Symmetry: C3
Subunit: 401 residues, 3 copies
């Protein structure tokens, strides 16, 4: 149920879909083609099912990392924007929407971790990681702590680990090299050691999670926290005078958080590919098009240079973009599952004292190959099931041989 | 123990073994060496078992795809024909008998898919795939269908898929590259799209198998079919005036069917390697030698250039050879099991509408990796079993270690 | 917990720990740093367990092949000896203590297979393998056999196999190549063929193991045997007049036995890295240092050039070194487990007549890959077990949550 001569668009419920419909309303007035915007529950899981059969939306809006799995399954169509339109967006955002050399989606919004500080407790935020231990002792005299952030998830701790030479997958020649993993290098060694040093010197607690860290900052117990744009609304409600700035540097090198890019992909089964190209390139990815969506729900930092400069007036957004350009793009390959599994264990075991930094990171490459073996055989058996599925419609109590 | 001084040959029961024995009788008259020709049941399965221990025949006759398995186990010997003898057979036939660079067998016969048409219904067969949809609805006015062939097996559907650039594995410098798979490329994409287009436009049924297609052509219900030389005898009995020609062209490019080559391999355990070479090169692979075998049971297209030119006077055999030269050789590598499994699913799902052309072909590497892992497990546990036999036969209940 | 200021060393119970303690006593007198030498049971098993948490010894003594697993886990520290000190030891010994390019331990002793002959029965030992069948016929008239050695283990049979062209994995500039396996090549083919020829010509029995071979030589039933320095003491007790010489040559090429190197590795978690370097380079690896250890329990051949020449005056030790230089270093890579499993089966089957030489070596790639995936399985399920247990003890309700 695609239906040619019209566009049906899928976008998550927490996004500005009403403003997107306004863009589609503008699109209808110029070309005479109606645009329907739908927001079904769990559309990221519904899409691969329906798009395989040849159904689903013409355009889908989701994070770029999930789009890699779609392009693997051949559900997304290769987009054809020329050199001039590619210059309209930030050059790095184009790397997020790439699979097997081909461009598969249009970058819309950019999301990344930033440093959030209490202005009343600390009007001058630190530029380096190394001055935070010294800052903690000075704030402990006033019954406060310098920095509290989520330590359970690798996503939050990676900016430090990365900062000086850490890397999950080496991005070279428009592709990720799965044979080159930078979790066991000297840069990642130093970053995690510094984090562990912060813990054993009582500057941070190893048991700290999202709930503990958010509550601590919103009550004004800690001076600084590391969080994304999604948490801004909760800090606004707590009346806390907060600022958002660039992440602290480690060994003179900037922190490298993972970059999440909200993207627009065209279904491969769609017979409205050139119409989707017209809508996305010339109606949505313009100053008006993004403004209409942003006013319904804030898009944060955007991929379009012209409108990003406009939004930059908000220093929070400017910091989101600055950390993103200093960070690295979330790899869209399936091998990322094994990476998260390995690094999560690595960080937890290093922080708790179960394993040393050198040993915890070394075991990560072993543990990553382990998840790979489980996954490579996980889908080997679901394939065996599907082979015996067809062996029931060919030769049975209905037709033999 | 394969008893030196004489030759023992294994060849399938459906082949011209009596004619081969006549070649052996001629060999015995010139050199004084007796030649035994045997045709045991399931000899393709019996060979790896007895050849490993040091037994079995001196020479074995089978299709080349099974010979890649025998070469892996090191059951076949490396043959040494000179440049002069290699020019006697078609250059491409030597690519079928190559494993790890070394030549392992002698090419004898050549099998490939061809286009078979009803002369009474259609005297002028289409040269392109693109003109078949238009030709169908003309024949549908007379209550007939243009083309009906097996769509369940990938072997039959591959010629179209391969045509524009699909491939199994890249063949370079006499070596297959298992990392270079061409099922997901644009050439294979267009081939399958056209096939799916034919089905949804009611020109073909998605659930058409071998039997339905064979029965339809033999009763004169369909104008065309795609099949090999093995099915000719059934069309002969049906009294249908049939012709065999080259496969249709897709996008100006020829169809590429897989080429099966009947080959003669020499056992590595054989003490009569010179006598096997002498018999195969100077006695069998001559006009006389192949004549005797062909008269007992037809070989189809042959590897020998001189005898093929004589057989090409039969327009059916000339068509089988023409399709083979245009097509690709069936890879002899073990990765082919994974290939067939994945492509079969890909085509079936694309034809039925379970998956789009793009999605079905994309899932092929994922489906091929499934067999790969499953074959690894299959040989992993059978290795563990035969290991535990070593530690229970040798080392227990009557001994400790020895 | 590795205390600082002092040194603690782990070395196996069957080694000269008392002599090593004397070196530590000398170290204490010059520097004022006390050295403790401990010999705990199954220290090779205990080291990976305690060194991962940050405990264990400062220095560990074991065979180099086990150290490859330690370097993978990041339990060993990279040693820093200059070019001048590297020239003090035999060049090849440094290749045994190398992992991923880095040097991970100090070579101490060298252990290799040698040809042991009864000089009463045979004063002139054969220099070639080819002349052994002719020698057996002469000795069978006197009711004796020419050669009897272990055939059940590949370690003993490999020297013959390797000599013409066999190799487990190709050693290059950096490390080992796990793709290039030389078990199926022509050189290894010929080597095993000759061994099978010896068995079917009734010169050797396929059922001969370590016990049968040792007993036959110590009673004086067989003229020759192939064994290491470990068996010398048993031949001493039997009063048999015996000599140790170079292994016979096959096709003019020397027999290539695997070389075992006893090595001293520094713990990565050690706070005494310079002190360990000082102790090992300047105190142990000297004429004086090794002599003390050698006098407690013999080291056999040594890595140090100066002390080896002095020990070479023993014809048995000089022969062990000569075979080692002609032979090949035992690979420290984990892929070796699969190699042993495959070759063990290949040789046994070829010797019993169960398979031909060609079919035996060809099947080796199959059962080597079979083990490879079988190890990947038990490694993968280790991860699952430790993951599901780590998430429960750190995430649950009952008694918590
Ligand atoms: Ca401090
Ligand atoms: Zn709809
Ligand atoms: Zn909804
Ligand atoms: Zn549909
Ligand atoms: Zn993500
Ligand atoms: Zn590179
Ligand atoms: Zn401090
Ligand atoms: Zn502006
Ligand atoms: Zn402005
Ligand atoms: Zn027979
Ligand atoms: Zn075949
Ligand atoms: Zn000739
Ligand atoms: Zn039509
Ligand atoms: Zn092909
Ligand atoms: Zn190529
Ligand atoms: Zn070429
Ligand atoms: Zn070429
Ligand atoms: Zn290629
Ligand atoms: Zn029907
Ligand atoms: Zn049938
Ligand atoms: Zn003739
Ligand atoms: Zn070709
Ligand atoms: Zn002194
Ligand atoms: Zn001194
Ligand atoms: Zn102790
Ligand atoms: Zn002890
Ligand atoms: Zn003899
Ligand atoms: Zn015994
Ligand atoms: Zn014993
Ligand atoms: Zn001294
Ligand atoms: Zn001294
Ligand atoms: Zn001395
Ligand atoms: Zn060497
Ligand atoms: Zn809970
Ligand atoms: Zn309980």
């Amino acid at each position: 149920k695609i239906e040619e001569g019209k566009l049906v668009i899928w976008i998550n419920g927490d996004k500005g879909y009403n403003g997107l419909a306004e863009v589609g309303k503008k699109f209808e007035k110029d070309t005479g083609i109606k645009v329907t915007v739908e927001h079904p529950d769990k559309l990221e899981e519904k899409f691969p099912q329906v798009a395989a059969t040849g159904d689903g939306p013409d355009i889908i809006f989701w994070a770029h990392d999930r789009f890699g799995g779609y392009a693997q399954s051949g559900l997304l169509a290769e987009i054809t924007p020329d050199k001039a339109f590619q210059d309209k967006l930030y050059p790095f955002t184009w790397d997020a929407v790439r699979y097997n050399g081909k461009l598969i989606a249009y970058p819309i919004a950019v999301e990344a971790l930033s440093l959030i500080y209490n202005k009343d407790l600390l009007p001058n935020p630190p530029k380096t990681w190394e001055e935070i231990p010294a800052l903690d002792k000075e704030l402990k005299a006033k019954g406060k702590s310098a920095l509290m952030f989520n330590l359970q998830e690798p996503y939050f701790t990676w900016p430090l680990i990365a900062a000086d030479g850490g890397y999950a997958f080496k991005y070279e020649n428009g592709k990720y090299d799965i044979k080159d993993v930078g979790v066991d290098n000297a840069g990642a060694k130093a970053g995690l050691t510094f984090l562990v040093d912060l813990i054993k010197n009582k500057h941070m607690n190893a048991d700290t999670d999202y709930s503990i860290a958010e509550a601590a900052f919103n009550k004004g117990e800690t001076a600084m926290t590391i969080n994304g744009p999604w948490a801004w609304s909760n800090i606004d409600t707590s009346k806390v005078n907060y600022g958002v700035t660039v992440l602290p540097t480690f060994k003179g090198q900037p922190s490298k958080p993972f970059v999440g890019v909200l993207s627009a992909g065209i279904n491969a089964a769609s017979p409205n590919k050139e119409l989707a190209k017209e809508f996305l390139e010339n109606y949505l990815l313009t100053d008006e098009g993004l403004e209409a969506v942003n006013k319904d729900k804030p898009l944060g930092a955007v991929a379009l240079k012209s409108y990003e400069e406009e939004l930059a007036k908000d220093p929070r957004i400017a910091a989101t973009m600055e950390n993103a350009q200093k960070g690295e793009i979330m790899p869209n390959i399936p091998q990322m599952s094994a990476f998260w599994y390995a690094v999560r264990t690595a960080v937890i075991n290093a922080a708790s004292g179960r394993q040393t930094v050198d040993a915890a990171l070394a075991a990560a490459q072993t543990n990553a190959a382990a998840m790979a073996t489980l996954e490579k055989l996980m889908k080997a058996f679901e394939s065996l099931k599907s082979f015996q599925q067809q062996q029931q419609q060919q030769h049975q109590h209905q037709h033999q041989q």
